[PDB]
Ligand binder design. Sequence first.
Ligand SMILES: [Fe+3]
Ligand SMILES: [Fe+3]
Length: 291
Amino acid sequence: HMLRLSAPGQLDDDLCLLGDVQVPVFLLRLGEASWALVEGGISRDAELVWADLCRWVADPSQVHYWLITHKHYDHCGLLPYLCPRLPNVQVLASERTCQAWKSESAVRVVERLNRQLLRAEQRLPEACAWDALPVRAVADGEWLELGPRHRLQVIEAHGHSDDHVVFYDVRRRRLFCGDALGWFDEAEGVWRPLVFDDMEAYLESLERLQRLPTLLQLIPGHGGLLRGRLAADGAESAYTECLRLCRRLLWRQSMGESLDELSEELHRAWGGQSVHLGSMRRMLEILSRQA
Ligand SMILES: [Fe+3]
Ligand SMILES: [Fe+3]
């Protein structure tokens, strides 16, 4: 499809997709000898992403920044395994996100969730400690002056998770929106809501994101790059789909349906491309809590 770039490699003059489109890691050419990464992947992809990186970047000492949208296992799983190979990298994440990496209970869930994704033959690279990562904490509204042509603004976007942020390149009308709009469904071309924390904050984040200057490029945490109207209308559409799901929880519960009976229907309907179910229930619980 032409409103959506989902192939590994070059997406724009300054931007490549590395690794798997479902859990991509984006690469920004900041300058002749200066690069940046955006989104932190899953752990098992450490060697794939590495191999993909080294095809665009001769010296990895040139990777200076790694931007992280939130703490979930599928958006920072690469950090302990590839940061040691990127000696000059500096990891930029929100205050709450950095605290997750200091929590031992939280780190243990990240590691366990990622380990369920390792293939039979494979083991992982040698790794940093999670509290040893070269990290600089960023705050809502901060400007990340990454290079002469790359200037991104950090925007708090809680709701998907209580730590979530997005990164706006206003020069390029390019939003790295993480999971804040949900999961884009390539089969039907609509967003699927990902509310795993607070529904009001999720809707409020989308309200603010809609007020951004018209997007040209919308880059979620999964699925690749969205352009044209998919980007322009992204935040409004995601907001709409979320409401749509609320009204359907309401409806089906007014007809005596358990959360599970709809947890199954939603898992059956969308879980064949985000492959969870236990996550699927905490969302339906969260939404039915606040309405
Ligand atoms: Fe997430
Ligand atoms: Fe995710």
